[PDB]
């Protein structure tokens, strides 16, 4: 079945750097656009970044523009997210999400609650 | 707390996967390799129904395999006579966003439902001769996607539940799905039914006790269509990942995957034939594919339709196969 | 989500106790069912026009 | 057989007379990011689907609301591919990023690539807030010469509102390719020009469709 | 239209040719 | 100009009687020679009188007079002019007539072959638009009605050519049959019907563009009426006017005021169309240019020009170019330009709106795949 596992995170000092990994199982990595979404404590889900199937189209939200970067590797079926110059505002639980439909250059309900194609997510605090 | 809940849940999933792997040594394709191929099948458009105004979502074949029901976005539920291509009935609908329709086995009642979250039951035959509203079930919170009649007083509905016609109350709720349930099928013995949601899991529910007996995984996208095998010990699912899958209740695992490289479109309608040898999947490339259930080979292509195919149905006696699409046409194939 | 997790664990435990027969037996059963009703399927074997409603 | 034919012809004439009015009604899909002032707009113009009927210049318009539906909008949105337009409301006053992502999803849908989108910037509260940290590109943004700000408006408010408009248009014009168009507007909840704006946008959409029918566009 | 004026001009030309040929035929 | 040959035999019969007086020196009285007759001649003197009016046509000299006598050997002087007993000026510009008839034959062949090609294309185009059920729509109904109008116009052209010029010119001059009048009436009806359907095509797109919220189904009958009955009414009015007043054989002459009954509406059916066309162009312009903000929309006026070029044959506005000309360059310009463009207009419209149409081609390729 489809499953997403997030690894990494933890407690780091503000302004540091940390790398998060997302492992996918049950489907082809290259056929879906992938997303990172954070949820702050006491707040709803907030979209962070998106990466296309081949990685040509990569975009980030304006809150963390110029600080966080995303990349994907289809051969290892894994996605990497590097965070540099951390901020206290970025204390949240992070979720690696898969777009519901393959071979579609868009996808809906990425930040929707009770999303089926979403991983467990890891808490990141500074 | 929640962490060890998740840990033993993962352990249970691993145990289920190991049990499924142990019970599987050879696939159905390996066994059916030595049987004769079905061959190339030619189907011709025997009748065309053009009375509809907008895109058509669902249809249901009749018990006598002559009368049918069709639902389109114009808000008209049309009862058709498939033999002489003459319209039998046209019932206006309160909500034009109808997504599903069902035909009673006795032929006296017809169900409709959609985004209004309300299922309307109409009496086809009455003393005064005009179809009226007989029941209005408004207990659901999500949009209705499929409905099937168990009998004249028992109905099963799919929303993203079991209802009694006489009292109009939700006597049984089938919970456990995470996504929106899109398709529902009824077993020949009217004792079990499979429901596919907006996820890889399709759940089998017993009609009486109302709990989920089995859960089947394997799909890679949202499940849109489901249909029981004529035998009743198996079923087929069509999802958005451009693949069709066959599962069985006794073994509780996947049989084979029907897919092609040239196909990148999801499946919206599946319906087995009388013998179960043909799967008759409906795709988004404006055409349907006839899939051999035992050899995973495309028997034929039904490219008569001009828009996306939404519903496909097979007669009870397996005489003709009807197909409705996003164009206001219903086409009958042999 | 403690209650939901408990419900999921209970559902998985219930699904663990079901008895599954071998895949080969079920495959043979479906093959025999398909071959027994092959002559009763007009789609598999074309029906003669004499008794065919749709022409 | 004849007993069936009189019923068939009666149903046929009923369907013809209903089609005579079905094509005269325009269907619109109303969408918003929750509490983005859409309900105020509905109250100004006047359980699963809430429908509103209003006649403008002897032309009927039938608008559909989201209603009591779950947040999972991937599936049922496909039911609104044949509507005349999708009126999408954005709270312009990070909900803005969520609205932008939703607009991107709606614009690029395979089934919704043939329907036009009427973009409304309902929350014109930029004057109260006088934003820069949320969008780093806004710091170096310059007001385009195409802007036509009304007299009596602060230049910073105009710069911010056209920055949001261009942020929406860059997604809108990324893959429009001419089959569908977007019509952004700087409207307000209490503004009475929403009906006229929708009327003009629908007229423009139908004229463009007619031009495409004759291959003139 | 152009068709009518062309037809009128051509029929006048044909009549003129016929008259001139009739007069020239009888030289006497 | 066949109304002069009758007096030749009239005078032949009038003076066919034997001479009543033979008391002259030569005895000449009351016989008819090739041109004129003399009742009685005084041999003492000879008079000079005007020549017969038959040669007044194609004559640059007015009031010419010749000397005529009675003598059988010579009616006039030995060498009065080119021909002895005729007017002073008889024949001129021999090669001009030959070059004119050659040019007329060439242009006749040209527009006939153009009309034939247009008809051949229009039959198959109409068959494609009518047989296929998918293409059935109001625009395609106006498109197929305009094709039928062009087909009828070409058929009437061919029938008129067969019944007017293919027949013997002497036979037509001697008498005009009822079939000639019927063919001319059908020709005028078809030409006016074709012109009125180019206007309807322009009016339909105009109504579609300016009035988006317009119900075409309940106004289709009005379009059919204005496209068919009005040309029929005008044709019947012209026919009854010709029958009542100035029949004069075959109704090919247009020098009478009744020709305006056909000329009047047709010009109008052009002018309004042109105006509508202009408005339609403006309707496109605001949409063709960048609607909201400035983009890299290179060459929008080029797109407007190509749209205008492809819309020229559907509207037939080119007729307004040389329609207003009363007599300016009529033979070498208005007729040549308007017959060639009129003959090829049907073919161009058929190949532009049926063969090159995206929807029609997309349906035709899938139909070809279905059949093979």
């Amino acid at each position: 079945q489809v499953q997403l596992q997030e690894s990494g995170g933890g407690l780091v000092q503000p302004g540091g750097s940390l790398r998060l990994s997302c492992a996918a199982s049950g489907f082809t990595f290259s056929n879906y656009k992938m997303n990172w979404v954070r949820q702050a404590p006491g707040k709803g889900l907030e979209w962070v970044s998106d990466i296309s199937q081949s990685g040509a189209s990569i975009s980030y939200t304006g809150s963390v523009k110029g600080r966080f970067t995303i990349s994907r590797d289809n051969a290892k079926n894994t996605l990497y997210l590097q965070m540099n110059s951390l901020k206290p505002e970025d204390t949240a639980v992070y979720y690696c999400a898969r777009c519901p439909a393959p071979f579609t250059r868009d996808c809906f309900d990425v930040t929707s609650t009770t999303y089926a194609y979403r991983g467990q997510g890891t808490q990141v605090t500074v | 707390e929640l962490d060890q809940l998740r840990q033993e849940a993962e352990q249970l999933k691993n145990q289920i996967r190991d049990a499924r792997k142990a019970c599987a040594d050879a696939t159905l394709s390996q066994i059916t390799n030595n049987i004769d191929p079905v061959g190339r099948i030619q189907m011709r458009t025997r009748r065309t129904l053009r009375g509809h105004l907008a895109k058509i979502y669902a249809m249901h074949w009749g018990t006598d395999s002559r009368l049918l029901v069709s639902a389109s976005q114009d808000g008209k539920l049309i009862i058709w006579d498939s033999y002489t291509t003459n319209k039998v009935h046209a019932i206006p609908l309160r909500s034009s966003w109808v997504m599903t329709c069902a035909y009673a086995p006795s032929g006296n009642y017809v169900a409709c439902g959609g985004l209004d979250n309300i299922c309307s039951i109409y009496n086809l035959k009455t003393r005064e001769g005009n179809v009226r509203v007989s029941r209005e079930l408004a207990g659901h919170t999500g949009y209705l996607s499929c409905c099937r009649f168990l009998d004249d007083n028992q109905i099963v509905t799919s929303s993203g539940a079991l209802w009694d016609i006489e009292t109009g109350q939700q006597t049984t709720t089938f919970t456990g799905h995470t996504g929106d349930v899109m398709s529902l099928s009824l077993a020949p013995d009217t004792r079990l039914f499979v429901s596919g949601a907006c996820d890889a899991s399709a759940k089998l529910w017993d009609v009486r006790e109302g709990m989920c007996r089995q859960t089947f995984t394997g799909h890679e996208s949202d499940i849109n269509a489901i249909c029981f095998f004529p035998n009743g010990n198996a079923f087929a699912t069509g999802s958005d990942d451009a693949t069709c899958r066959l599962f069985d209740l006794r073994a509780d695992q996947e049989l084979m995957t029907y897919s092609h490289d040239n196909i990148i479109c999801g499946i919206t309608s599946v319906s087995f034939s009388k013998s179960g040898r043909l799967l008759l999947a409906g795709y988004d490339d404006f055409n349907c594919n006839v899939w051999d259930a035992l050899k995973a080979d495309r028997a034929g292509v039904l490219a008569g339709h001009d828009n996306r195919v939404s519903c496909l149905g097979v007669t009870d006696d397996g005489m003709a196969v009807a197909t409705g699409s996003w164009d206001s046409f219903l086409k009958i194939w042999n | 989500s403690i209650a939901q997790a408990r419900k999921l664990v209970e559902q998985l435990k219930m699904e663990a106790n079901i008895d599954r027969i071998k895949v080969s037996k079920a495959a043979a059963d479906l093959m025999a069912y398909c071959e027994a009703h092959a002559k009763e399927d007009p789609l598999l074997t074309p029906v003669p026009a004499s008794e065919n409603p749709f022409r | 057989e004849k007993a069936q034919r009189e019923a068939n012809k009666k149903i046929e004439k009923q369907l013809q007379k209903d089609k005579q009015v079905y094509r005269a009604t325009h269907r619109l899909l109303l969408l918003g990011a929750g509490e983005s002032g859409k309900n105020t707009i509905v109250k100004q113009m006047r359980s699963g689907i809430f429908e509103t009927k209003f006649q403008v210049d002897k032309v009927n318009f039938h608008m559909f609301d989201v209603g009591a539906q779950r947040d999972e909008r991937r599936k049922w949105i496909q039911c609104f591919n044949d509507v005349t337009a999708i009126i999408f409301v954005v709270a312009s006053s990070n909900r803005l990023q969520a609205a932008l992502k939703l607009f991107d999803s709606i614009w690029n849908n395979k089934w919704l690539r043939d329907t036009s989108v009427i973009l409304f910037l309902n929350k014109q509260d930029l004057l109260a807030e006088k934003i820069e940290d949320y969008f780093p590109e806004f710091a170096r943004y310059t007001t385009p010469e195409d802007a036509t700000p009304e007299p009596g408006e602060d230049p910073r408010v105009t710069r911010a509102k056209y920055f949001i408009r261009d942020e929406f248009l860059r997604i809108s014009t990324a893959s429009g390719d001419g089959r569908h168009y977007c019509y952004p507007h700087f409207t307000c909840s209490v503004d009475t020009e929403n009906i006229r704006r929708v009327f003009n946008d629908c007229r423009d959409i139908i004229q463009r469709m007619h031009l495409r029918q004759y291959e003139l566009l | 239209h152009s068709d009518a004026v062309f037809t009128d001009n051509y029929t006048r030309l044909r009549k003129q040719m016929a008259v001139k040929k009739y007069l020239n035929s009888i030289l006497n | 100009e066949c109304d002069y040959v009758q007096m030749i035999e009239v005078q032949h019969k009038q003076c066919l009687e034997e001479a009543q007086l033979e008391n002259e020196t030569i005895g000449c009285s009351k016989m008819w020679d090739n041109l004129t007759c003399w009742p009685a001649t005084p041999r003492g003197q000879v008079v000079v009188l005007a020549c017969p009016l038959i040669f007044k046509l194609f004559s640059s000299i007015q009031g010419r007079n010749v000397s005529r006598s009675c003598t059988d050997e010579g009616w006039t002087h030995l060498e009065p002019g080119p021909y002895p007993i005729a007017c002073g000026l008889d024949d001129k510009a021999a090669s001009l007539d030959e070059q004119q008839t050659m040019f007329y034959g060439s242009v006749k062949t040209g527009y006939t072959i153009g009309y034939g090609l247009s008809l051949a294309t229009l039959l198959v185009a109409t068959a494609i638009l009518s047989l296929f059920r998918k293409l059935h729509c109001t625009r395609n109904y106006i498109h197929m009605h305009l094709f039928i109008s062009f087909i009828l116009r070409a058929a009437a052209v061919f029938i008129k050519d067969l019944a007017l010029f293919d027949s013997g010119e002497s036979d037509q001059c001697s008498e005009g049959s009822v079939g000639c009048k019927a063919a001319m009436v059908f020709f005028q009806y078809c030409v006016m019907a074709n012109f009125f359907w180019l206007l309807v095509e322009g009016l339909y797109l105009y109504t579609l563009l300016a009035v988006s919220f317009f119900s075409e189904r309940k106004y289709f009958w009005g379009y059919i009426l204005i496209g068919w009955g009005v040309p029929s009414t005008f044709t019947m009015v012209w026919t009854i006017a010709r029958i009542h007043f100035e029949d004069y054989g075959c109704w090919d002459t247009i020098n009478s005021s009744l020709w305006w009954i056909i000329k009047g509406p047709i010009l109008t059916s052009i002018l309004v169309n042109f105006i509508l066309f202009i408005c339609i162009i403006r309707i496109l312009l605001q949409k063709l240019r960048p609607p909201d903000i400035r983009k890299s929309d290179s060459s929008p006026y080029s797109r407007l020009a190509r749209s205008t070029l492809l819309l020229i044959p559907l509207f037939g506005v080119h007729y307004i170019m040389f329609a207003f000309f009363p007599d300016n360059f009529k033979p070498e310009v208005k007729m040549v330009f308007e017959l060639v463009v009129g003959s090829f207009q049907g073919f161009v419209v058929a190949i532009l709106y049926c063969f090159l149409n995206g929807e029609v081609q997309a349906e035709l390729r899938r139909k070809w795949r279905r059949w093979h």
Side-chain angles (χ1 to χ4, degrees), chain F residues 257-268:
Chain F
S257 175
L258 308 185
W259 159 242
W260 272 111
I261 305 185
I262 304 297
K263 186 174 175 66
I266 287 173
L267 281 189
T268 299

Side-chain angles (χ1 to χ4, degrees), chain D residues 170-185:
Chain D
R170 68 180 65 252
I171 308 170
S172 166
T173 63
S175 58
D177 304 351
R179 50 193 92 81
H180 57 303
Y181 304 87
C182 179
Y183 309 85
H185 293 283

Side-chain angles (χ1 to χ4, degrees), chain A residues 33 35 46-47 50 60-63 65 100-101 104-109 111-117, chain D residues 70-74 77 94 97 101-102 104-110 112-113 133-136 175 179:
Chain A
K33 160 194 267 163
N35 297 295
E46 293 179 353
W47 172 81
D50 55 350
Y60 316 85
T61 195
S63 308
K65 183 94 73 173
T104 61
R105 63 181 175 89
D106 62 349
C107 56
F108 298 70
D109 292 330
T111 61
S112 74
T113 179
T114 81
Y115 184 56
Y117 317 115
Chain D
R70 288 176 66 248
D71 52 299
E72 287 265 19
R73 69 172 54 83
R74 161 182 57 257
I77 206 78
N94 200 351
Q97 183 62 255
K101 293 306 291 186
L102 182 49
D104 193 302
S105 306
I106 297 169
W107 194 256
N108 297 295
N109 194 12
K110 44 177 314 188
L112 303 174
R113 69 177 64 251
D133 58 60
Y134 293 100
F135 299 91
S175 58
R179 50 193 92 81

Side-chain angles (χ1 to χ4, degrees), chain C:
Chain C
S1 178
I2 290 178
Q4 185 62 255
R6 293 181 184 271
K7 213 152 196 181
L8 178 55
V9 176
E10 190 276 331
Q11 174 57 42
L12 285 171
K13 293 187 286 185
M14 185 64 72
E15 290 178 16
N17 290 318
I18 62 170
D19 315 303
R20 299 165 184 84
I21 62 170
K22 269 287 308 166
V23 62
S24 287
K25 189 159 63 175
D29 291 331
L30 282 71
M31 182 179 72
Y33 182 86
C34 295
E35 293 179 353
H37 297 70
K39 68 181 178 67
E40 301 158 35
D41 199 7
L43 276 298
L44 206 54
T45 61
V47 64
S50 174
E51 291 278 354
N52 188 3
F54 313 97
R55 285 251 52 95

Side-chain angles (χ1 to χ4, degrees), chain A residues 71-106:
Chain A
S71 62
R72 78 186 290 156
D73 184 7
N74 295 338
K76 292 177 71 68
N77 290 318
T78 300
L79 188 153
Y80 292 165
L81 185 68
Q82 183 62 75
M83 293 180 183
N84 308 332
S85 69
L86 269 295
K87 186 180 289 293
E89 182 65 26
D90 303 329
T91 295
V93 62
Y94 278 80
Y95 299 117
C96 168
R98 182 211 82 178
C99 294
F103 312 118
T104 61
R105 63 181 175 89
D106 62 349

Side-chain angles (χ1 to χ4, degrees), chain A:
Chain A
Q1 69 174 120
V2 65
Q3 174 195 324
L4 307 168
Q5 183 62 255
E6 293 83 3
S7 66
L11 176 63
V12 296
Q13 295 297 109
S17 66
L18 73 165
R19 195 178 188 88
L20 261 63
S21 306
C22 167
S25 172
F27 66 97
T28 50
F29 208 60
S30 62
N31 292 0
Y32 304 76
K33 160 194 267 163
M34 296 282 204
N35 297 295
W36 268 110
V37 170
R38 65 178 64 88
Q39 183 174 22
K43 269 156 279 301
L45 289 150
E46 293 179 353
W47 172 81
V48 173
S49 64
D50 55 350
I51 178 157
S52 193
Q53 321 186 177
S54 53
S57 178
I58 291 179
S59 295
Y60 316 85
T61 195
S63 308
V64 298
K65 183 94 73 173
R67 300 189 286 134
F68 296 173
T69 178
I70 190 167
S71 62
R72 78 186 290 156
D73 184 7
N74 295 338
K76 292 177 71 68
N77 290 318
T78 300
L79 188 153
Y80 292 165
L81 185 68
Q82 183 62 75
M83 293 180 183
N84 308 332
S85 69
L86 269 295
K87 186 180 289 293
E89 182 65 26
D90 303 329
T91 295
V93 62
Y94 278 80
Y95 299 117
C96 168
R98 182 211 82 178
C99 294
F103 312 118
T104 61
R105 63 181 175 89
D106 62 349
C107 56
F108 298 70
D109 292 330
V110 176
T111 61
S112 74
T113 179
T114 81
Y115 184 56
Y117 317 115
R118 212 156 53 202
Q120 296 294 321
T122 79
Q123 192 84 234
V124 163
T125 183
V126 290

Side-chain angles (χ1 to χ4, degrees), chain F residues 82-198:
Chain F
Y83 182 76
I85 59 190
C87 301
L89 179 137
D90 300 322
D91 288 318
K92 83 170 84 68
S95 174
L96 188 153
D97 293 331
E98 182 66 27
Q99 87 200 43
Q100 201 72 354
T101 189
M102 183 278 288
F103 186 77
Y104 270 98
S106 174
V107 76
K108 179 178 182 293
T109 57
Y111 80 89
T112 45
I113 62 170
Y115 268 123
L117 168 58
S118 165
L119 195 51
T121 314
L122 282 158
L123 276 296
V124 298
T126 315
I128 288 166
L129 268 70
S130 192
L131 289 177
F132 289 69
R133 201 159 182 163
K134 157 166 204 183
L135 299 175
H136 281 196
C137 60
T138 311
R139 162 179 68 96
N140 280 330
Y141 291 154
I142 304 281
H143 281 202
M144 73 180 56
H145 271 243
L146 175 73
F147 295 165
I148 301 299
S149 85
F150 276 108
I151 282 169
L152 294 174
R153 171 175 188 165
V157 162
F158 285 143
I159 301 299
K160 183 257 290 180
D161 282 5
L162 188 153
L164 277 296
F165 309 130
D166 289 329
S167 180
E169 45 170 2
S170 301
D171 309 342
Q172 293 285 335
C173 175
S174 303
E175 184 66 28
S177 312
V178 186
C180 173
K181 303 172 184 179
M184 185 64 72
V185 162
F186 188 57
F187 180 76
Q188 296 286 346
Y189 171 85
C190 282
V191 162
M192 185 179 288
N194 182 219
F195 271 113
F196 270 61
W197 269 101
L198 289 168

Side-chain angles (χ1 to χ4, degrees), chain A residues 1-3 26-28 31-32 98-103 109 114-117 120-121, chain B residues 6 10 13 178-179 197-200 217-223 240-242 263-264:
Chain A
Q1 69 174 120
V2 65
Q3 174 195 324
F27 66 97
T28 50
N31 292 0
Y32 304 76
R98 182 211 82 178
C99 294
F103 312 118
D109 292 330
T114 81
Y115 184 56
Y117 317 115
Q120 296 294 321
Chain B
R6 291 185 173 161
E10 199 256 335
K13 292 181 181 179
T178 61
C198 277
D199 60 356
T217 58
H219 267 311
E220 283 173 17
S221 188
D222 291 331
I223 293 177
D240 268 359
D241 49 6
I263 310 182
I264 62 170

